[PDB]
Amino acid sequence: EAPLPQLRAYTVDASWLQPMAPLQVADHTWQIGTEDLTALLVQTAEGAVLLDGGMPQMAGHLLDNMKLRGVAPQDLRLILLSHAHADHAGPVAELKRRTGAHVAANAETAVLLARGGSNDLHFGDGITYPPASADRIIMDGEVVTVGGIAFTAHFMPGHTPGSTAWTWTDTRDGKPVRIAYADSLSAPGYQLKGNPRYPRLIEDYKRSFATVRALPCDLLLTPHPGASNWNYAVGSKASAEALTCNAYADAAEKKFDAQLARETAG
Amino acid sequence: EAPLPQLRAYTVDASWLQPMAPLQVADHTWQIGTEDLTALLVQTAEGAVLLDGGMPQMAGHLLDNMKLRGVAPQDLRLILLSHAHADHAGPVAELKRRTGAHVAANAETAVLLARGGSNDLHFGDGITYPPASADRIIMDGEVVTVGGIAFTAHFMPGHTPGSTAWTWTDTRDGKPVRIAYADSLSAPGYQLKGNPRYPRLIEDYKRSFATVRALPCDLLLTPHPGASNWNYAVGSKASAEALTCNAYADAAEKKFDAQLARETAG
Amino acid sequence: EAPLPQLRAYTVDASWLQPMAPLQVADHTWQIGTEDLTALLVQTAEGAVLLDGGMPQMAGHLLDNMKLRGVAPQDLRLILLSHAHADHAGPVAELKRRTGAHVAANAETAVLLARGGSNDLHFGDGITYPPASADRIIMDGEVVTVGGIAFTAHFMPGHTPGSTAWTWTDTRDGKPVRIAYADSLSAPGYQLKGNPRYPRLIEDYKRSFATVRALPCDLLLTPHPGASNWNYAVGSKASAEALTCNAYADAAEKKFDAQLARETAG
Amino acid sequence: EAPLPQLRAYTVDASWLQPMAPLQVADHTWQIGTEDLTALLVQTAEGAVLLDGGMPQMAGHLLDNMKLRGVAPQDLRLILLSHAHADHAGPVAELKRRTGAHVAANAETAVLLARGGSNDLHFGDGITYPPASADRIIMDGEVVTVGGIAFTAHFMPGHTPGSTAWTWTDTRDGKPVRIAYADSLSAPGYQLKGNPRYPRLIEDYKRSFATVRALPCDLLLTPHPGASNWNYAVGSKASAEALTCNAYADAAEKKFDAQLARETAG
Numbered sequence A, B, C, D: 001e002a003p004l005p006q007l008r009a010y011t012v013d014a015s016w017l018q019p020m021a022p023l024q025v026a027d028h029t030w031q032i033g034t035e036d037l038t039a040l041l042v043q044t045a046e047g048a049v050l051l052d053g054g055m056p057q058m059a060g061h062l063l064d065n066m067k068l069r070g071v072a073p074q075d076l077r078l079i080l081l082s083h084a085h086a087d088h089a090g091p092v093a094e095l096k097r098r099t100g101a102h103v104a105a106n107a108e109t110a111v112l113l114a115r116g117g118s119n120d121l122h123f124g125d126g127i128t129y130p131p132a133s134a135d136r137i138i139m140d141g142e143v144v145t146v147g148g149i150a151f152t153a154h155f156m157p158g159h160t161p162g163s164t165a166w167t168w169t170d171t172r173d174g175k176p177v178r179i180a181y182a183d184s185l186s187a188p189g190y191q192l193k194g195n196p197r198y199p200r201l202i203e204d205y206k207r208s209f210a211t212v213r214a215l216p217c218d219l220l221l222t223p224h225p226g227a228s229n230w231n232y233a234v235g236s237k238a239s240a241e242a243l244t245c246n247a248y249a250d251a252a253e254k255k256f257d258a259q260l261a262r263e264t265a266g
């Protein structure tokens, strides 16, 4: 008779694993991940910051791209996260071992990271990755500064309880560019209504749409570039179609409301 | 050009995942795992002890077999481990959540369990499983008692730094039966000589062969039943060919010495 | 010249350490702490729940009072917390070791408990106690059930980020009694305005006053009994002067507003 | 009647808390702790290593002395430990927060550090300090390298299960100086015989005396300088009376044997 099933790997679309060379976003900020997963390197005079790392197998590629930017592994000071799912926080444990960087995250993200994404409220154990510890717990609105560049956290729970937007002001052409790295606002396959593991899920998403609308933003980026209409594969045109924060929140809320009604409709 | 490779699942021989009904080993001790992975249930008047759980996907099967033995999930008091690899400690996190059982383990096993088997000294991240915490740290020779049944730990590092044998005295036919659950003594694909991550690996294995030879033992069991010549599929004959501790240690040391010479021979 | 100062113990008023016999609050609910620190035992047909434990040195007294109630150490299933300061979560690590109970707490409380109250946002390292791990992370509004008794969490951040109210329905004289165990709403010596470690502190307190006002409540209790006008020393009259949730929130908000104005006034 | 006792601070002799200016031990190695607690700074071209930090309240003094040596807080790369008691690992959590340094330690030291020294096998909760996590787990004989300087770990369990000696080769007057930082070999107030929490304590101490005798050593230092006959207060004569490793082990074993006989004599 049937044995128990084999473990199943977390597999993703090939484009999520397609390496790309560093793509400059602003004077200090570079996309160094893959064509379809964001990993932002912010280079300061006193070390570098990494916002997300993508999938677990991207660790070596990130370090290669850091080197192309002039950033040795030991020059990475800080890792920040949008949320601690395997496709965004995947390589954090290995990056910490190889660079000595600290991780700063809120308490929800810290607990999810420390169990390697296992016992996910919606996905169970299907997206487990190597666990890592947060070295600094941050609060809503708290400012983290590296090399004089200030990163502000904005909690936007929903996609995960610890989902966070990060904002900072870079420059281009002598003018300030307020960058907003807003987290995912999707709820893929989630039970939204009356979820015993997340009883206030709908209230949190609804508040998070409003938080995203209010972010300081001249240039929006998202963990999945397509969610904000970026196309990392087309170089200097990558940002051309990028959404505003208002438009990103509006699109996400329309999808959310439609899913809520479909969930009511079985 | 080539994308990065997909993550690869830890896949195992089908027999390792083949469920079996509880097989009685002695008056209080039952094999409740699969045909080719040991999971021992020891039933006391004040709750049950589980020694190993096998693969992550075995959690539900273990609880089903516990129920057949009269053990409700909440009746499981304690989980002990041979070593914290995915094929023996796989379901520990889920079992803790569903039963409330505590885990007792030495410090090496505790740290490996808490990172879900990631950053393995020999296997890297290939056998990651859901992380779990140890609630009680135990020392070499320490006695853990449940319902009056005393379990003694014997450290036998090598296969993992935290590899542990557990001994207890059960009964059969009114006579004592000294059970020894000795850990794996294999080194599959390991660099044995001059390993920078495990510099005293050879000294530890050699000492562990001697520890196994000295265990109090009328009946030897091992995490992989074939390592001690058990055959769980043949019921009342399962133990017929089981090795002594002396013979298990001798076979393991001969394989180890041969591998050492082959490693010297490239 | 002066050596560095000696470490300073966290010392408290004597009444906080004055043992008392169990005081019945409702049919299943007992105050089993000290005259001036709440520790609530809820006894079910399938084990007991403890809400808070007081100071670290109260562990033995709590177990003595449990025994007087018919609760053996192993009968304690679950520990819940108001917040993870030393005077309320102090003995949690020792209670877990001696009872096997699981701890359920939100992520903020879990991270503070796991560092033993060290690096407190307001108190630094002055109130460090033995660290403990949370076995179950709970979300706002999540229901935890033991022996059929359902406990609902209501997040009320401010006094700590993880501050939680717990509600359950007990009985007395054949009628339901909705019990609300609401956390502290004090801010003792806290910098309220522009606090870089807690930038939205004021917004959180203000929301928490509203949450407390809305709790289902026939009988309010608080970690410090005086905060809700209980007097545990007078037995059957202990609850006579107890505040409503509305009155507790109103008193706390008036104190908060006054402190805010004094902080503005240097 | 009597309330429960107040918590008691871990108080130490004043000389353990008496700051001193940096005292040069060899070309790259400086004592930067207090007159009676060792904290060794090793300065490399690629950052600094700290071996022990003393008491929790010494964090600021250590950073001041680092600054006098030209080491900014961010220049500290690595913290190593002799053992994780409050008088040697006390300030590790704060140093990690303020410097970004990683901690490397064996599994036993890592688990004790992570519970802040609470639930000590011999001292209970009396010497609890702020918990910290180890970022790198090291094995017996493993080499950790910073700026080209190689530090080798030698496990010497007894005083704690995780007690470790660290060796490295510095220079003086153009000649190599093999430095051995050997851990404590005391057993203050310990039950040595038949200790249920440490059943092989005597075997471990006896092996550790032999390990210390075998260390590569031109210059021995110890966490308590008096244990190896150092006197940090007399500057250029501080090392004059320092013991050899053989003499340190011999003195420690004689004290141990005498205590064993006194323990046998009640």
Ligand SMILES: C=C1CO[C@H]([C@@](NC(=O)[C@H](C(=O)O)c2ccc(O)cc2)(OC)C(=O)O)N=C1C(=O)O
Pocket (backbone or CB within 6 Å): A010, A011, A012, A085, A086, A087, A123, A126, A127, A159, A184, A185, A186, A187, A188, A189, A223, A224
């Ligand atoms: C829109 C998506 C969907 O894809 C990923 C996601 N999901 C998946 O990759 C995918 C899925 O939802 O179909 C999945 C595959 C396998 C699983 O075991 C779980 C999820 O990553 C975990 C998720 O967060 O839902 N992430 C997002 C996102 O917004 O970040």
Ligand SMILES: C=C1CO[C@H]([C@@](NC(=O)[C@H](C(=O)O)c2ccc(O)cc2)(OC)C(=O)O)N=C1C(=O)O
Pocket (backbone or CB within 6 Å): B010, B011, B012, B085, B086, B087, B123, B126, B127, B159, B184, B185, B186, B187, B188, B189, B223, B224
């Ligand atoms: C003899 C073996 C080999 O099989 C397992 C083992 N190995 C494997 O299952 C297998 C292998 O060694 O070929 C393996 C598959 C995939 C991997 O990524 C790593 C290891 O489990 C992790 C191991 O510990 O070596 N365990 C033992 C054992 O003695 O416990």
Ligand SMILES: C=C1CO[C@H]([C@@](NC(=O)[C@H](C(=O)O)c2ccc(O)cc2)(OC)C(=O)O)N=C1C(=O)O
Pocket (backbone or CB within 6 Å): C010, C011, C012, C085, C086, C087, C123, C126, C127, C159, C184, C185, C186, C187, C188, C189, C223, C224
């Ligand atoms: C109103 C108070 C004040 O007393 C305690 C408290 N504070 C103290 O006990 C006390 C103080 O605030 O004066 C204190 C003594 C010593 C310290 O190091 C820190 C705080 O416990 C940590 C606190 O949370 O502020 N708790 C409350 C409370 O509402 O729970």
Ligand SMILES: C=C1CO[C@H]([C@@](NC(=O)[C@H](C(=O)O)c2ccc(O)cc2)(OC)C(=O)O)N=C1C(=O)O
Pocket (backbone or CB within 6 Å): D010, D011, D012, D085, D086, D087, D123, D126, D127, D159, D184, D185, D186, D187, D188, D189, D223, D224
């Ligand atoms: C010889 C000693 C004695 O002093 C310290 C020690 N002990 C004490 O400081 C002291 C004592 O043993 O008398 C102590 C004071 C208070 C306590 O709660 C516990 C211990 O530090 C924890 C210890 O490790 O035993 N350390 C050593 C040592 O060798 O490192």
Ligand SMILES: [Zn+2]
Pocket (backbone or CB within 6 Å): A083, A085, A159, A184
């Ligand atoms: Zn996601």
Ligand SMILES: [Zn+2]
Pocket (backbone or CB within 6 Å): A085, A087, A088, A184, A223, A224
């Ligand atoms: Zn995603």
Ligand SMILES: [Zn+2]
Pocket (backbone or CB within 6 Å): B083, B085, B159, B184
């Ligand atoms: Zn294995």
Ligand SMILES: [Zn+2]
Pocket (backbone or CB within 6 Å): B085, B087, B088, B184, B223, B224
């Ligand atoms: Zn195996």
Ligand SMILES: [Zn+2]
Pocket (backbone or CB within 6 Å): C083, C085, C159, C184
């Ligand atoms: Zn408090």
Ligand SMILES: [Zn+2]
Pocket (backbone or CB within 6 Å): C085, C087, C088, C184, C223, C224
């Ligand atoms: Zn309090």
Ligand SMILES: [Zn+2]
Pocket (backbone or CB within 6 Å): D083, D085, D159, D184
């Ligand atoms: Zn010590």
Ligand SMILES: [Zn+2]
Pocket (backbone or CB within 6 Å): D085, D087, D088, D184, D223, D224
């Ligand atoms: Zn000491």
